[PDB]
Design a binder for this molecule. Structure first.
Ligand SMILES: Nc1ncnc2c1ncn2[C@@H]1O[C@H](COP(=O)(O)OP(=O)(O)OP(=O)(O)O)[C@@H](O)[C@H]1O
Ligand SMILES: [Zn+2]
Length: 69
């Protein structure tokens, strides 16, 4: 089932690339219509980035959660 290919890829993508800042914790994310938004940092590092005043690692990558556009 092609939807399963997409799901399995998104599981892998989420697992293998942790937070860009601490490089250990998984990333924060949200689901937004038919898309998965994976933010660049875990919540801990994101909250801290606000406290320290660094926007460098702010950002996200959106992913279609299904196989067919
Ligand atoms: N965990 C995270 N890692 C990296 N960037 C993040 C994370 N959470 C939020 N951001 C991004 O940091 C920026 C500042 O976030 P904030 O929530 O203060 O503003 P916002 O405009 O309400 O965010 P958004 O545009 O997502 O609604 C936004 O571009 C937001 O997408
Ligand atoms: Zn982190």
């Amino acid at each position: 089932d092609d939807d399963d290919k997409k799901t399995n890829w998104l599981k892998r993508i989420y697992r293998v690339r942790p937070c860009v800042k601490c490089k250990v914790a998984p990333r924060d994310w949200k689901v937004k219509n038919k898309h998965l938004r994976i933010y660049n940092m875990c919540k801990t590092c994101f909250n801290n980035s606000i406290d320290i005043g660094d926007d460098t690692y702010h950002g996200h990558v959106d992913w279609l959660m299904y196989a067919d556009s």
